[PDB]
Amino acid sequence: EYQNIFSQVQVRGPADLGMTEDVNLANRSGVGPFSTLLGWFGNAQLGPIYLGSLGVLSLFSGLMWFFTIGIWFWYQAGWNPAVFLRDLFFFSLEPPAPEYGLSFAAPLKEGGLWLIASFFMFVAVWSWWGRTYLRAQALGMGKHTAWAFLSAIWLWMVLGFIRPILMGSWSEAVPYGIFSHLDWTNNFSLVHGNLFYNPFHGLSIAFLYGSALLFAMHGATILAVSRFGGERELEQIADRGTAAERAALFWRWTMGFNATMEGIHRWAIWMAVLVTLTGGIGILLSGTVVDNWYVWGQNHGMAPL
Amino acid sequence: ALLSFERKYRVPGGTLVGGNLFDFWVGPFYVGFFGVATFFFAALGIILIAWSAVLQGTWNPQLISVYPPALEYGLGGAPLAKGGLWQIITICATGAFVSWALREVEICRKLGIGYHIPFAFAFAILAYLTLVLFRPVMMGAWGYAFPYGIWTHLDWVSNTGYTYGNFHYNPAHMIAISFFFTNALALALHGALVLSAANPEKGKEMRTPDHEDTFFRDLVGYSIGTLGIHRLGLLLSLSAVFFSALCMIITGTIWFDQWVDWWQWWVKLPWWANIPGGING
Amino acid sequence: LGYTGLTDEQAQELHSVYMSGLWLFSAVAIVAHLAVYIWRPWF
Amino acid sequence: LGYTGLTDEQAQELHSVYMSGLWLFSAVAIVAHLAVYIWRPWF
Amino acid sequence: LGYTGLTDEQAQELHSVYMSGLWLFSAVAIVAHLAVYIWRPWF
Amino acid sequence: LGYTGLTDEQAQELHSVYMSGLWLFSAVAIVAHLAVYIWRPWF
Amino acid sequence: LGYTGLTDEQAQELHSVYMSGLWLFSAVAIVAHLAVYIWRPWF
Amino acid sequence: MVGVTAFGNFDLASLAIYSFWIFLAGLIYYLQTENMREGYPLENEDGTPAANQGPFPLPKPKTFILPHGRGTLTVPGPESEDRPIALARTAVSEGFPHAPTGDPMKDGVGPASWVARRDLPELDGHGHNKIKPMKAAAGFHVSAGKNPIGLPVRGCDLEIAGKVVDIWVDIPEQMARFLEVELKDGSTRLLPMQMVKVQSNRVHVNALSSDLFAGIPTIKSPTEVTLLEEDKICGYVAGGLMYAAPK
Amino acid sequence: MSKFYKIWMIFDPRRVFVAQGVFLFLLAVMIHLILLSTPSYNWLEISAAKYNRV
Amino acid sequence: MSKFYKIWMIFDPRRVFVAQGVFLFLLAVMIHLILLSTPSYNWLEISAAKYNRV
Amino acid sequence: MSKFYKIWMIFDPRRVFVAQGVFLFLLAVMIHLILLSTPSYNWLEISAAKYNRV
Amino acid sequence: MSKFYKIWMIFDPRRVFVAQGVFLFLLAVMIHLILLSTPSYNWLEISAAKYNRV
Amino acid sequence: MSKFYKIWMIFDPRRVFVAQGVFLFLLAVMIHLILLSTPSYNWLEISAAKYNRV
Amino acid sequence: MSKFYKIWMIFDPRRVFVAQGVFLFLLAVMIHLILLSTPSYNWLEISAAKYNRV
Numbered sequence A: 001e002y003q004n005i006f007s008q009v010q011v012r013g014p015a016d017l018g019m020t021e022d023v024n025l026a027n028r029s030g031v032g033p034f035s036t037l038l039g040w041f042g043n044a045q046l047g048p049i050y051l052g053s054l055g056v057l058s059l060f061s062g063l064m065w066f067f068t069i070g071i072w073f074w075y076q077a078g079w080n081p082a083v084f085l086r087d088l089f090f091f092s093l094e095p096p097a098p099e100y101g102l103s104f105a106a107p108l109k110e111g112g113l114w115l116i117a118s119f120f121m122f123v124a125v126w127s128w129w130g131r132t133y134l135r136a137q138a139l140g141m142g143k144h145t146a147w148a149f150l151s152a153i154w155l156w157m158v159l160g161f162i163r164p165i166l167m168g169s170w171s172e173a174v175p176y177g178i179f180s181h182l183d184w185t186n187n188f189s190l191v192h193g194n195l196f197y198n199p200f201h202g203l204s205i206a207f208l209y210g211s212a213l214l215f216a217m218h219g220a221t222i223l224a225v226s227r228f229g230g231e232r233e234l235e236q237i238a239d240r241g242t243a244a245e246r247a248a249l250f251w252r253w254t255m256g257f258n259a260t261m262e263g264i265h266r267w268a269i270w271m272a273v274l275v276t277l278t279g280g281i282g283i284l285l286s287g288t289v290v291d292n293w294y295v296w297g298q299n300h301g302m303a304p305l
Numbered sequence B: 001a002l003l004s005f006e007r008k009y010r011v012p013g014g015t016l017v018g019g020n021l022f023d024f025w026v027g028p029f030y031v032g033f034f035g036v037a038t039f040f041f042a043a044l045g046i047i048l049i050a051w052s053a054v055l056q057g058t059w060n061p062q063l064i065s066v067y068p069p070a071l072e073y074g075l076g077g078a079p080l081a082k083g084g085l086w087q088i089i090t091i092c093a094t095g096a097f098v099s100w101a102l103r104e105v106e107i108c109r110k111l112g113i114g115y116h117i118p119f120a121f122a123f124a125i126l127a128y129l130t131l132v133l134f135r136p137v138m139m140g141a142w143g144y145a146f147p148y149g150i151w152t153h154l155d156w157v158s159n160t161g162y163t164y165g166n167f168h169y170n171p172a173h174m175i176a177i178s179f180f181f182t183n184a185l186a187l188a189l190h191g192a193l194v195l196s197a198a199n200p201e202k203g204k205e206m207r208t209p210d211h212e213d214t215f216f217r218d219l220v221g222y223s224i225g226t227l228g229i230h231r232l233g234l235l236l237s238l239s240a241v242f243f244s245a246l247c248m249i250i251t252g253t254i255w256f257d258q259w260v261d262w263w264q265w266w267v268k269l270p271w272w273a274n275i276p277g278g279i280n281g
Numbered sequence C, D, E, F, G: 001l002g003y004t005g006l007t008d009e010q011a012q013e014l015h016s017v018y019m020s021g022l023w024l025f026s027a028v029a030i031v032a033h034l035a036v037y038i039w040r041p042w043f
Numbered sequence H: 001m002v003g004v005t006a007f008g009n010f011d012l013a014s015l016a017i018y019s020f021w022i023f024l025a026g027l028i029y030y031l032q033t034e035n036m037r038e039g040y041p042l043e044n045e046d047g048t049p050a051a052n053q054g055p056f057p058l059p060k061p062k063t064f065i066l067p068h069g070r071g072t073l074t075v076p077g078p079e080s081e082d083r084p085i086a087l088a089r090t091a092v093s094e095g096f097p098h099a100p101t102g103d104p105m106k107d108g109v110g111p112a113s114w115v116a117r118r119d120l121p122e123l124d125g126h127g128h129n130k131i132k133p134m135k136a137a138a139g140f141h142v143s144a145g146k147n148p149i150g151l152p153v154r155g156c157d158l159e160i161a162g163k164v165v166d167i168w169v170d171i172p173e174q175m176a177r178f179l180e181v182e183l184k185d186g187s188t189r190l191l192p193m194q195m196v197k198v199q200s201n202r203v204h205v206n207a208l209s210s211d212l213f214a215g216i217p218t219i220k221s222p223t224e225v226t227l228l229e230e231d232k233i234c235g236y237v238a239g240g241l242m243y244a245a246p247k
Numbered sequence I, J, K, L, M, N: 001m002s003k004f005y006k007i008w009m010i011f012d013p014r015r016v017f018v019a020q021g022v023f024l025f026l027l028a029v030m031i032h033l034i035l036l037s038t039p040s041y042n043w044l045e046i047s048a049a050k051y052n053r054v
């Protein structure tokens, strides 16, 4: 009857400081508090966190980005805490107006402060990518996380930097707001015909649904075979046990083919990087090559015409 | 035919309906009672799709569409060429899905594993049934369901969304999208981490789960663990699908207006309703 | 009793100092209420 | 007793310096409020 | 008592240097405010 | 101290080099500001 | 000192070569700015 | 570039979509080939190689270097079961189940199967045993759940089978893995923690009946458990679900 | 009275000092923002109006 | 008072003091916000009306 | 006063100095931004108006 | 100046130098962007105006 | 000054050189983009207008 | 200047060579795309105009 969804007994010992492969231990912190809720679901220990030079860079730039957007929101609220709470999710930093193009001459109230915040955010995100690469390297691991993050960065860069330059205007970029960037996506789909008829939109949606499908499948399988110690997959790769065998046989008797304890993770990483990569391509194509996706679909056998 | 380790697991037991009857394999597949049922329903649905394509007059697989009955039929039968085929295909699709889930249960109990996978699949079946059965039945007609076509069910999505203005102002929609995005992020991170531990720098030994724990503790200051990450993936996927089903079931049944107008209850709270500043003032 | 570990004398002394603090806070509140009621009464 | 752990003679000196800081902070606050009230009273 | 591992002498010298820095910073800020108030008083 | 391990002499020499660098950077900054102010004053 | 393990002589030699590279880069940049300013000045 | 076609209706969007189709075919081929590193080549039900092997060719070997001097592993490679399987054919034609010759839980076939893993304990990143009894683990204690130590153990037949004496803990993950259960004869067995339900006043094991607790494979060293012993125990306990349905 | 110092045997001084500093700064900022948002006591606007800055 | 001193046999002083501080502050803030929300008793607006600040 | 130096026997000077630097920079940036957003005290626009830069 | 050199007995110079470099570069870029954002002080646009570039 | 060689006893030349290279390239690309974005100092269109190529 | 060869003492030649190959190719492709984008310096179109190919 136990479904292994929540832990039923929770044990604590000395905190684990981690490995020392070639990490600079002076740049680590201490262990944080233990948390019983996280212990119910997963691990209870918090920390230690590594903070080196790239971490200082990322923290400074991201803090400045968050602070710039927040101070703009406070200016819009009239420095009123009540108005700030009420109209939160309604404030936004807008990019420059279309008349200014790509120029950096737009005023602070119009689009200059958006440019400042965007510079801060660009630096923060690229330094965080460098941090993921260097943290993988210090421990001697492969850089799979860095390249998957690079896929995500590719979509972010297309949305905020690459497509506005190809279109020749900063006004093409995304505002910094909660409802405002949602309105931005709706207007983007409306201006460019119907984004449903962008085929790379369709591929991106296929791979998003595929991520949900695959990782429900995989989480359920690991939970189902965890009675045999299936969740310790790194040693099921080195020493195949009955858990991996039973998982493979379930999926082979069900859908005709199966995976390994490592090939399934290759499937996983590719299924997610593909959603973000195809999305980047589809957004870059919108407006620069196709200005009306429904008409493109009519010309390409996708709409009745 | 068999995997190098498959032979010892193929034993006579664990069926739900029938006994030694239907207790055999066809190639790699296991075909029980519900295997036969699944095959029948799926083949019938696929042939009926092809026959609907014949009726419609198109052979382009991207233009084939099977439409539900018009609103004038309500929740009753329709002529085959004018909505009856859609109803038959819906019954076949439901039967195929439910028989697939029951076949998976039979495989689970033949292999001695838990039934997490059929439960997770049942969540998706319930989302499909929400879109095709529960919401049309509450709304009063089969024509509120979506058509069976590659690019026309996207037309259904577009029209249904734009009936209520901009659709990602629906709150449960916001929750479902957040869960979907978080799930894709978690899947990418998990696959990358496992691969990087199993495939280190060239000439290195394999890493251990301690190295993975250390990698994410160095990166973000917290590691959820292996059991934790698999529980998280299952729950993120299921919560995404559950909240999508909810946001659709409340859409044409309780709500009827633009959702951006729903968000005005927060703005019109009595203690800041009339303060003159900001966006809504 | 053994819930917290404080003995009888410790609990008594702790309560004495706690009551001192409570009465000081209450006296400040009473003066504040008197000032506000003189300025703009609510009865 | 000291649950965090400080001798009574450590606690007394920590409280003495804390009172010094509190009184300095509050005196600066009184002067600021006096200046603001003279400039622009709120009663 | 010395939760940081600093003795009385180390703390006194540290505080002396920190006070010198604070007073330098405050003098610069005071001069900046004096210049701005002469340029454009806010009262 | 034991925080970093530099001795008094090492720290003094390090601070001398750091202050030379700071004064060079500030001199360049002052020259730039003087040029800009002659070209376009902001007061 | 012990942060990198470079000898004082080693650091001097590396700094000399690095400063040669820096002067080469800066001289090319200065010629570039002179040529651009003659072509189309920005002041 | 709007409307700029090289031929027909072929523009940068069409070029991109066809390039992606070719890339996706190549990637699916790569992913399946990488999946094909375990359990291949395919076999006949009498053990011989199968005439049909599949569309995808077998990948080139790759080598893992195991930590702590545990050796190397080259996959795909020559993999044998290395254990006798007590199963009999029920049909001459293929595709039909194989019937246990004797006691399936004893023999380790079907849902009670186990794999000949390494007879060594699994290690952490420092070289110590990954799993230890909570008495051996210095500084470990039960934190936030119902402590099972001392609770009676009840099988699926409504009868008491012993009592919980210790908890075996995964030191790196800091999670409980096994329950050590002392039987009537003063011998201890290990139960996977994923297979027991800790109630208010008992521990319920639905997979196994009270008598069957005697047949759980034991550990040769009281202070540690190896991977082979974990497979034997978990296979037995899981096969109890199918093979202890009566009583 | 005269025995409030014993509070420091109940509370860790550094945790209390951190919480107190954060609390005091947040309170001060909140009051300053409340006074800025009011048309009265907005010292920048009333100084601008008195000296004819607009 | 009479016998209430024994409540500390039961409740740990750290928990009680923290909860009490949070409760008192939130209560004070709630009463102040209620007084600010009424057009009467809003000491900022009524002082502006009394001295003609607008 | 004379006895404040004992704050350093409670708080680590390194952590205090880092938090103090971040706090001071963010406070100064916020005040400069507040002044810039104000029609008056926007020194750039004030100089633009005085010298007829526009 | 007086005794500030003891700062290097408290802080690791590597961390201080990296933090200074990051802070100084980000601050300089922010100020330059603010100057480009003002219609005055945008040296490119005002050079264009004074030489009739556009 | 003339003691600046000692920075290499503090910093590893490999890290400094990679960071310097990426910083210099990114700064150059940024300044070129700034110049191309403005209608003036876009040398391509300046040459186009001067030689009447449009 | 005559001693820059010691750069290979500190940088792995293979990483540097791969990095500069990728860098140089990307730079050349970007510059060619920029030139093709502008109506001037699109050599195909200007040759078409020059040779009266409609």
Ligand SMILES: CCCCCCCCCCCCCCCCCC(=O)OC[C@H](COP(=O)([O-])OCC(O)COP(=O)([O-])OC[C@@H](COC(=O)CCCCCCCCCCCCCCCCC)OC(=O)CCCCCCCCCCCCCCCCC)OC(=O)CCCCCCCCCCCCCCCCC
Pocket: A141, A142, A143, A144, A147, A148, A150, A151, A154, A269, A273, A277, A281, B195, B199, B200, B201, B202, H012, H015, H016, H017, H019, H020, H022, H023, H024, H025, H026, H027, H030, N018, N022
């Ligand atoms: C004719 C047209 C069709 C074209 C193709 C057709 C050809 C036939 C089909 C070919 C398909 C083959 C697919 C198989 C690939 C699988 C390989 C693999 O996974 O493992 C091997 C290998 C490592 O295996 P391993 O056993 O795990 O190694 C362990 C190591 O010991 C230790 O680990 P490590 O340190 O060595 O690194 C581990 C990592 C390492 O692999 C890598 O190094 C990947 C490098 C990053 C990707 C390159 C783009 C970055 C930009 C260039 C700048 C850097 C270049 C230099 C890279 C440094 C390499 C030294 O391995 C991974 O598994 C990572 C998987 C996730 C990678 C996701 C990357 C997405 C980045 C998004 C970029 C977006 C910008 C442009 C987008 C497109 C523009 C329109 O990984 C790879 O080789 C990854 C290949 C990267 C593919 C890039 C994507 C192509 C996108 C094209 C989309 C379609 C075009 C349609 C649009 C057209 C518009 C007009």
Ligand code: BCL
Pocket: A125, A152, A153, A155, A156, A159, A184, A185, A186, A187, A188, A189, A194, A195, A196, A200, A201, A204, A205, A208, A275, A276, A278, A279, A280, A282, A283, B157, B181, B184
């Ligand atoms: C009316 C609205 C339009 C429409 C307009 C758009 C537009 C416009 C876009 C999408 C995009 C996407 N849409 Mg669509 N979309 C519609 C209908 C749908 C439907 C549906 C059932 O109807 C579905 C399922 C989807 C699904 C999808 C996704 C597959 C895809 C986004 C991927 C992603 O993860 O982005 C989210 C992820 C990112 C943006 C990456 C972020 C990475 C960076 C590095 C993160 C930085 C974080 C920052 C530092 C955070 C600080 C955080 C703190 C540390 C906590 N759309 C309709 C037709 N959609 C995108 C796309 O790629 O399309 C091709 C896109 O741009």
Ligand SMILES: COC(C)(C)C/C=C/C(C)=C/C=C/C(C)=C/C=C/C(C)=C/C=C/C=C(C)/C=C/C=C(\C)CC/C=C(/C)CCC=C(C)C
Pocket: G010, G013, G014, G017, G018, G019, G020, G021, G022, G025, L025, L028, L029, L032, L033, M013, M027, M030, M031, M034, N003, N004, N005, N006, N007, N008, N009, N010
């Ligand atoms: C929006 O903002 C705008 C654009 C308006 C303005 C903003 C502007 C800023 C903030 C600009 C910043 C400009 C700066 C700060 C530039 C710094 C330039 C520097 C510091 C350049 C140094 C270049 C030094 C270089 C290339 C060194 C070259 C050295 C070499 C090849 C030789 C090194 C070899 C060494 C071999 C090692 C061998 C030694 C041994 C012992 C083995």
Ligand SMILES: COC(C)(C)C/C=C/C(C)=C/C=C/C(C)=C/C=C/C(C)=C/C=C/C=C(C)/C=C/C=C(\C)CC/C=C(\C)CCC=C(C)C
Pocket: D010, D013, D014, D017, D018, D019, D020, D021, D022, D025, E001, I024, I027, I030, I031, J025, J028, J029, J032, J033, K003, K004, K005, K006, K007, K008, K010
């Ligand atoms: C919306 O509501 C509105 C805004 C309208 C009004 C509502 C308002 C409320 C609810 C306001 C709250 C007001 C309160 C309750 C304010 C708290 C005021 C206090 C109590 C402030 C504490 C001041 C004490 C201060 C700064 C302490 C200075 C202390 C020191 C330096 C201590 C030194 C300690 C040391 C040095 C180490 C020595 C160590 C040894 C061992 C000797």
Ligand SMILES: COC(C)(C)C/C=C/C(C)=C/C=C/C(C)=C/C=C/C(C)=C/C=C/C=C(C)/C=C/C=C(\C)CC/C=C(\C)CCC=C(C)C
Pocket: E010, E013, E014, E015, E017, E018, E019, E020, E021, E022, E025, F001, I025, I028, I029, I032, I033, K024, K027, K030, K031, L004, L006, L007, L009, L010
């Ligand atoms: C919206 O609200 C507005 C913005 C309108 C107004 C609200 C305003 C507020 C709430 C303003 C708060 C202002 C505050 C709270 C200011 C506190 C400013 C401080 C505390 C400044 C400290 C200056 C101290 C400085 C730079 C440090 C000088 C320290 C030194 C050089 C460090 C030297 C110490 C040493 C080296 C180590 C000695 C080592 C040995 C071994 C002896």
Ligand SMILES: COC(C)(C)C/C=C/C(C)=C/C=C/C(C)=C/C=C/C(C)=C/C=C\C=C(C)\C=C\C=C(/C)CC/C=C(\C)CCC=C(C)C
Pocket: A066, A067, A069, A070, A071, A073, A074, A115, A118, A119, A121, A122, A156, A157, A159, A160, A161, A174, A175, A176, A177, A178, A181, M030
């Ligand atoms: C009291 O609260 C305080 C004030 C303390 C702080 C609270 C703050 C708030 C309320 C912060 C609001 C944060 C929000 C609401 C952020 C919205 C973030 C979103 C949702 C962004 C959504 C899409 C953004 C996208 C794609 C951005 C893409 C950006 C880019 C690639 C960066 C491009 C970099 C470049 C443009 C400009 C180039 C210029 C130079 C000088 C390199």
Ligand SMILES: COC(C)(C)C\C=C/C(C)=C/C=C/C(C)=C/C=C/C(C)=C/C=C/C=C(C)/C=C/C=C(\C)CC/C=C(\C)CCC=C(C)C
Pocket: C010, C013, C014, C017, C018, C019, C020, C021, C022, C023, C025, D001, I003, I004, I005, I006, I007, I009, I010, J027, J030, J031, J034
């Ligand atoms: C409009 O009306 C609304 C809707 C807003 C609500 C209407 C009404 C209500 C429901 C109002 C609630 C009123 C209440 C119930 C207020 C509670 C007031 C209390 C209970 C105040 C307690 C004040 C006590 C205070 C400050 C004591 C602090 C004590 C200390 C310093 C002394 C501690 C020092 C010590 C302990 C050392 C201990 C000794 C040793 C040996 C360890």
Ligand SMILES: [Fe+2]
Pocket: A218, A222, A233, B194
């Ligand atoms: Fe996994």
